[PDB]
């Protein structure tokens, strides 16, 4: 069934490193490899390709984004201010 | 080695040729002999 | 090596001036036949036959103005 109670994909790390270190990478695993939404077809199938490069599973067209999220709040706010003019 | 340069091979041949003894007729009237295993000609 | 049974294309080569060599087998299927071979300057012309009479006819259809030879 559910093999890991709380560790999740950090189970690859065993008991090494701090529990709080793994639990602070906890805030980020469930979204680093996540399938985000592509705005050129509309299927939530974008994948982490490199540090700042992102790709969906349909377009084969690449987007510059965040380190482990497709968009970061800092850039979204800036785009909002620019677009409101 | 099997693969070698022309100058190296010519020098090897010259050093081989310089390793024969004094001719018998001349002796009837040498110190610089090497063995391949004893003294290396340093090339 | 060119396995062939069409007759017109095989008799087409009957004018090529540079074919020289011929090879005669005696192969027993179980029936005595032969697999005649001729010489081609760019491939290895060898014919598999089906009829002994046909093999006999086409080993004489050759113009004999050149060499004769056989491995056996």
């Amino acid at each position: 069934s559910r093999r890991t109670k709380k560790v999740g994909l950090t189970g690859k790390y065993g008991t090494r490193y701090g529990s709080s270190l793994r639990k602070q990478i906890k805030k980020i695993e469930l979204m680093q490899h996540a399938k985000y939404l592509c705005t050129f077809c509309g299927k939530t199938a974008t994948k982490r390709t490199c540090v700042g490069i992102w790709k969906c599973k349909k377009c084969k067209r690449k987007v510059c984004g965040g380190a482990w999220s497709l968009t970061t709040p800092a850039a979204v706010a800036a785009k909002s201010t620019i677009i409101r003019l | 080695g099997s693969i070698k340069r022309f100058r190296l091979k010519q020098r090897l041949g010259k050093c081989r040729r310089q390793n024969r003894p004094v001719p018998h007729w001349y002796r009837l009237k040498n110190t610089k002999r090497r063995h391949w295993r004893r003294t290396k000609l340093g090339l | 090596p060119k396995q062939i049974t069409d007759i017109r294309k095989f008799l087409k080569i009957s004018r090529k001036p540079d074919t020289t060599a011929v090879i005669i087998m005696k192969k027993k299927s179980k029936t005595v036949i032969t697999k005649l071979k001729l010489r081609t300057k760019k491939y290895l012309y060898t014919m598999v036959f089906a009829d002994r009479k046909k093999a006999e006819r086409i080993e004489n259809s050759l113009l004999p103005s050149l060499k004769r030879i056989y491995y056996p």
């Binding site: 680093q32 067209r61 510059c64 965040g66 380190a67 482990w68 800036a78 201010t81 | - | -």
Partner: protein
């Protein structure tokens, strides 16, 4: 004593940048009449990873106007630009994310990247991943514009200087914890030979002023003067203060 580790770095034998796989210098388009008096639009064909840096690069094709032909320019990509979009560079370029504009033409409060601190520098400031400067003021007479850099510093740059509109991509890269020595090794393998560090206090006194002793301590104050020579500048150089800050 002998020459210390920090002193040997300037010789540049093994401390030169590991740059075998780098894709090229990230530079803005060279200043041209077209860029000086209006938009010129280039198409970003591809977004590449430069092994040294964390910020992805944009391969923008510009069709040259002095001859038949296209020209390839490698520009640090802001967060949001995508393969196939058209990017306008120039005085009359519209103010949108990724466009290259003169600094005095944009309104104030806008976030910018790839800042060029002297006109014609084709990009000098604000280039690390996730970094952005903000336009905090236009001079009343023009020809001068005030920005706030990611360090919090406040700078005045002439209004003709160009910059990219938006923030540098791959933002937040320093957030995830480096779990192990291995990925730090891989990180610095494509940058430099600055890792591992080795404490100067664990060395011998011949190689470091912190070295020596029976108990592995510095022994003398670690705040060194700004005028200290090369083999002496090892502690906290010209430190205005020490200890935890208070905000």
């Amino acid at each position: 004593g002998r020459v210390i580790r920090g002193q040997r770095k300037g010789r540049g034998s093994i401390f030169k940048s590991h740059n075998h796989h780098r894709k090229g210098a990230a530079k803005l388009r060279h200043l041209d009449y077209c860029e000086k008096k209006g938009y010129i639009k280039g198409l970003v064909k591809d977004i590449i990873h430069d092994p040294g840096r964390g910020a992805p690069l944009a391969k923008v094709i510009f069709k040259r106007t002095e001859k038949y032909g296209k020209k390839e320019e490698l520009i640090i990509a802001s967060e949001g630009m995508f393969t196939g979009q058209y990017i306008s560079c120039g005085t009359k370029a519209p103010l949108s994310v990724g466009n290259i504009l003169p600094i005095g033409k944009m309104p104030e409060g806008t976030l910018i990247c790839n800042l060029e601190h002297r006109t014609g520098n084709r990009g000098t400031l604000v280039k690390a991943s996730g970094c952005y400067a903000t336009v905090v003021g236009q001079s009343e007479d023009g020809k001068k514009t005030k920005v706030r850099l990611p360090s919090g510093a406040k700078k005045t740059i002439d209004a003709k200087a160009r910059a990219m509109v938006g923030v540098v991509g791959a933002g937040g890269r320093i957030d995830k914890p480096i779990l192990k020595a291995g990925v730090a090794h891989h990180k610095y393998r494509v940058k430099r030979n600055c890792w591992p560090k080795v404490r100067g206090v664990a060395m011998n006194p011949v190689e470091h002023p912190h070295g020596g002793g029976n108990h592995q301590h510095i022994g003398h104050p670690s705040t060194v003067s700004r005028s200290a020579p090369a083999g002496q500048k090892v502690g906290l150089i010209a430190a205005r203060r020490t200890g935890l800050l208070r905000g």
